[PDB]
């Protein structure tokens, strides 16, 4: 982790709850992470989106 390698949360796009914490290099990856993850509230896979930590 550093100034360019930020920590972040993943938010389920359907129910809005943040289910995952992770990291990325915002120089290499300026756009928001989008990743299908299993949401335990919706109980199914959902596109999650990077959100400010």
């Amino acid at each position: 982790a550093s100034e360019v390698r930020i920590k972040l949360l993943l938010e389920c796009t359907e129910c809005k709850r943040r289910n995952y914490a992770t990291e990325k290099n915002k120089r290499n990856t300026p756009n928001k992470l989008e990743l299908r993850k299993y949401c335990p509230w919706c109980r199914k896979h959902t596109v999650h989106r990077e959100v400010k930590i």
Binding site: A1, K7, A21, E23, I53
Partner: protein, 64 residues
């Protein structure tokens, strides 16, 4: 005069029915982003304190 209950102990720990001392695992108050889901899940459970340390804590809870 009569012993006083240690309240730091009372707030952190429980004496079980058979006299074990059970506490919350340490290590997940923060700095959790790069911790595997295995580390977080398992740190969320209670554990049984080793006997020498349990004997000390129990004496601090004379009325539990």
């Amino acid at each position: 005069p009569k012993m006083k209950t240690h309240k730091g102990a009372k707030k952190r720990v429980k004496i079980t029915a058979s006299g074990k001392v059970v506490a919350m695992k340490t290590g997940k108050r923060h700095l959790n982003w790069q911790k595997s889901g295995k580390e977080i899940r398992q740190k969320g459970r209670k554990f049984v304190l080793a006997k020498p340390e349990a004997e000390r804590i129990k004496l601090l809870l004379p009325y539990e």
